[PDB]
Symmetry: C3
Subunit: 456 residues, 3 copies
């Protein structure tokens, strides 16, 4: 006996349902082995990795991660891979869980415009990463070529109310985090394992705000969690909750009641969550600078009745989530498009600045700019700002400490530098500030900030 030895395929061939993240195909719901036909197409395309930041992704099925594949242990899978004629590269696939050399790699080699096929029996139950296997393999994986395949046990997984698909990846851009424009792949950063972004589902904000996952108090949620890498290991964590179960790949071991769990590069797990009180629960890589400085956060939003005996506090806000507490940051997307066209208005900057000011500045200076008297000075109708509004550029980039006076009050505190903000972010935030709360108005341009960043 090999494992998964359930019989020869019965019935008619089934054309496999593939779904785009964050959704999952439905449970196969059958008691017999089948011949399952899978057709997956590779597409190379520019998408937004962040607001106003484009990247040329290489994809299985048009998304990052690629289409989710779901079969039953014991099935025979006929796997067709098409490489769209617009592709510039050849591609192939290695599916973890396949029994055989390269997990399909050699037989699935597929030049642009061609199709390949190989067949495999699904011997091993579990959740499994797949990815491209074409030299240079790391470049293909870094450009987005990974996804998950679930091989169900024969009796199926226990019923839950929702199933979702989330996959972490590390990305390597020539430019720095949130530097606008079309960003090429950066080999030197990738070789050093120094990613510029670390993301769930292929982009900043892919699962935050209006794109959050949903469920309700009392419901159970299953998440199929993959780490496509290429390089990082995820300290995968849920803020404000606990996983009832974590199960790696097809392992016999199941861990229960943990909140933080390590996912290897190329690894995958099924986690289970029971919603107990309402609010936003954040999935992160708890190597914290990834979560909070490189994009590695996703949200499961829960609706229903508060339970004050369990938790009396308020919903997550911009103090913790920063600029991702909002529904989106499309004002940034719009202001960047407008700069590229040469049609950038003051109001474009203002609305972009407003999006960016949340968390980043509001944590100390408040949402309304009032500050807190004696502790955090006001930006609302600030005489200090008005006295030399161009010095505000230096303050953002390089910080401010020492004694100062603002609206006739003394302050002796420290504003840390925020040098990681790109020129356009600083310009837009300051332009927002100048046009709010009865401040003088005017505008700061990215060119102005650039001049100041360059001053010793």
């Amino acid at each position: 006996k090999l494992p998964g030895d359930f019989g020869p395929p019965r019935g008619e061939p089934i054309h496999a349902v593939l779904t785009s993240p964050p959704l999952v195909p439905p449970p196969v719901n059958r008691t017999y082995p089948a011949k399952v036909i899978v057709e997956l197409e590779v597409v190379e395309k520019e998408m937004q990795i962040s607001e106003g930041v484009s990247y040329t992704f290489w994809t299985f099925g048009g998304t990052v991660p690629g289409s989710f594949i779901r079969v039953r242990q014991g099935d025979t899978v006929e796997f067709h891979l098409k490489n769209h004629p617009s592709s510039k590269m050849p591609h192939n696939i290695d599916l973890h869980g396949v029994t055989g050399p390269g997990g399909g790699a050699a037989s699935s080699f597929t030049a642009p415009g061609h199709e390949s096929q190989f067949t495999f029996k699904a011997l091993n139950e579990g959740i499994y990463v797949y990815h491209c296997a074409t030299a240079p393999v790391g470049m293909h994986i870094a450009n987005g070529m990974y996804g998950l395949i679930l091989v169900e046990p024969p009796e199926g997984l226990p019923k839950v109310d929702h199933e979702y698909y989330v996959m972490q990846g590390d990305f390597y851009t020539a430019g720095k985090y949130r530097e606008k424009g079309l960003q090429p792949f950066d080999m030197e950063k990738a070789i050093d394992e120094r990613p510029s972004y670390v993301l769930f589902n292929g982009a900043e904000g892919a699962l935050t705000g209006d794109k959050a996952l949903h469920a309700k108090v009392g419901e159970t949620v299953r998440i199929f969690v993959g780490n496509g890498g290429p390089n990082l290991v995820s300290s995968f964590h849920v803020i404000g909750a606990i996983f009832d179960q974590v199960r790696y790949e097809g392992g016999t071991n199941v861990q229960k009641n943990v909140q933080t769990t390590l996912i290897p590069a190329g690894g995958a797990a099924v986690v289970k969550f029971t919603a107990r009180v309402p609010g936003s629960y954040v999935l992160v890589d708890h190597s914290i600078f990834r979560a909070f400085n490189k994009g590695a956060m996703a949200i499961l939003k829960i609706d229903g009745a508060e339970n004050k005996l369990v938790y009396s506090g308020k919903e997550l806000d911009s103090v913790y989530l920063g600029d991702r507490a909002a529904p989106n940051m499309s004002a940034v997307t719009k202001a960047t498009q407008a700069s590229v066209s040469g049609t950038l208005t003051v109001q474009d900057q203002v609305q972009a600045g407003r999006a960016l000011f949340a968390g980043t500045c509001s944590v100390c200076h408040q949402g309304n700019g009032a500050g807190l008297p004696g502790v955090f000075p006001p930006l609302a109708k600030s005489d200090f700002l008005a006295a030399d509004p161009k010095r505000a550029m230096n303050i953002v980039l390089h910080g401010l400490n020492g004694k100062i006076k603002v609206n006739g009050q003394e302050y002796d505190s420290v504003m840390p530098p925020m040098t990681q903000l790109n020129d356009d972010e600083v310009a837009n935030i300051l332009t927002y500030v100048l046009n709010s709360w009865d401040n003088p108005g005017g505008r700061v341009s990215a060119e102005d900030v650039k001049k100041v960043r360059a001053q010793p």
Copy 2:
């Protein structure tokens, strides 16, 4: 039924006992749920991260890690957070193990001089990291804002003879490892996950030498081990022993009889150790350059009878532990204070040099400078040293190889460069050598070493 559903609180409210590392509050020792009141205050302050190296830590309760909190599963916790008026930043808290959004973050936002409160029921048993959750979150965590909370099971943990509290963290200074002075936080290093120090309990030597943890042969020791990060995953290991048990957070899985175990960023474990033979057992991050080049070592010292049938060897010494085999290195602290004052004496340098020479130089040249004839040349009454004592600076910084003669004996070997030693370390070591073992005397200054480091 939610978990931890034991009843409404009974009795009088309990004011929670918080302890400073490395100690732990005592077992709650009760059979009923209580309302537990926790008061924790944030304090920003300079402390010594290393000898003569100050750092502005942000702390829960005045220490890194912060005060340890201990409650019982099923308790209702009323959590008060005070931010001391000397603070420059606002702060808050996210406690892993809390059921609710942000783990307390939004309701615990607390400006300098203010107090906040929220209430939560402790549904989940286990050991859990807490940390600040204030944008920019990574900066707050990197500056020391983390600690542990234990939620006991209802029957309590099994009795052991000692309980200790150890928490790893990664730190990001503008200066290099052991560069003296007040070191600011370095954002670029933190974003790249390139820490300058990796520490247990907030400082080099915090748990070595005279600060070691203690127990005796036959006793059981429980250690609550946290990894506050922000970024690193610890290959947590005990040198010369084994953990009887390792249990992550509140997990149902318990691993037994391992010596090396991975702790995620933001993760925590309870480990158990049974002392079997006397000596020093070293807790490290076995990503070795952290343990031996960045400070990631702590010591559990065991007293009692030798058992020669089990182990015939000698106690740990400076060959392995380097300069941390000694009780402390306070001579370095003193010599650095003296340089800052402009009052540095030759004897100050000598005693600093002596502390630093252990391991670093003594492994080859021996504790008494004799060397080993033909293999390692002597520093004790060295004619080669005396012939040009200023060339000793180049030898330390850039190494020495090739044929040489010293006290009329031939040597053809390789002394590796030690360029990572800071100017003052080299000056002090050489000054020690010059004033020991009937060498010529004199002194080398940090300015001298600086001049030589700068020569091509």
Copy 3:
């Protein structure tokens, strides 16, 4: 009762069998405790870390990893360590699994030309890393000073058909990956955890090609897998198969049916594999850039009958494995020796280029240079190449995009830059191309490529 309390030693002392990787000593096959005498000698020596790249390794027993030691739980081990007189450094050992301080470190300190000994009882069953423990510890470990010791349970491990020994390590060279010559240890890279190579068994290709491990369909294979570090954690994975069992050190927990598993720095595991279909199965660190850009791949080659009902595809090839699909790359070794001697022929370059062209260029331009019409242009009898063969250097280093014509066909595609190729690699590949497929002939030298790399 201590654990492993089986009695005082009986019979005659046994001189321990030590084996070189990838082999393992045989099972002790005994029912009583013994006094086991172990003699291990340290040797410092230059070996090839890669083709034409020498490195001064520090070794236990002449190999990296060091000799494998196998004893029975309950044995008393008398451990002799000799440091060969040619050594320049003192050395010692810390064996995980030893009960006692330093795991032997202090008593095993051994200068060049000397011998030391200590005795220990093997209380703890499992697989355990050993390594040198001599300041600076990280340098000694980085230079190759680690290996494995197995302490068998008293009844022995279950019988399998083959046992193998594989140990990952991270290496830090002054030069870049595949830069030729004698490469010194690089401390700054090591401190930053930025390795230039990541290897199984001490070298690129140590377990690929004609050095692969072997077994047959239906056979069971046990691999003792170590991670000597010094710094990296391995996302240890088998391509195209599954581990029936993974067991860390002496842990009671055994995980089954996984394909990817995290191995800590300093950790070790026993894995079990059952061969089900023929072909090459790749052991990698699935932090992918390590596997595919730094050398972290090894091969288990399986012989026997195909099973088309399980897997219909072809054997692994150069699309996935790149230049390690071949038996070896000794043409590179030879061409590098010839350059050092000043005797490099065109044919030397051609054969080196041929080795390197596999994967690296053949994935798009094909093994025969034909390309694919309209998609990948030909290198076979290429008029575009012939028109300006020196522009081929720029194409390799810096890529090519835009519209071009080659053998009267239009192309508008993208050839990515390959700037990580060293000067000699580029020269040799191009020299191969020029002398194949009726191309013009001639040669490109490393000096030519160097001149072009230096042009802005």
